PDB file of C-alpha atoms in Angstrom:
ATOM      1  CA  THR A   1       0.027   0.009   0.006  1.00 29.21           C
ATOM      2  CA  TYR A   2       1.385   3.518  -0.647  1.00 28.41           C
ATOM      3  CA  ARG A   3       1.126   5.511   2.543  1.00 28.96           C
ATOM      4  CA  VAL A   4       1.638   9.251   2.763  1.00 29.12           C
ATOM      5  CA  UNK A   5       4.180  10.256   3.822  1.00 29.45           C
ATOM      6  CA  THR A   6       6.346   5.016   0.913  1.00 27.00           C
ATOM      7  CA  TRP A   7       5.226   1.560  -0.052  1.00 27.38           C
ATOM      8  CA  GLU A   8       4.378  -0.463   3.006  1.00 30.54           C
ATOM      9  CA  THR A   9       2.867  -3.667   4.383  1.00 29.44           C
ATOM     10  CA  UNK A  10       0.941  -5.515   2.877  1.00 30.64           C
TER      11      UNK A  10
END
């Protein structure tokens, strides 16, 4: 998942 601020789990 792309979280604001990166791609992260899952």
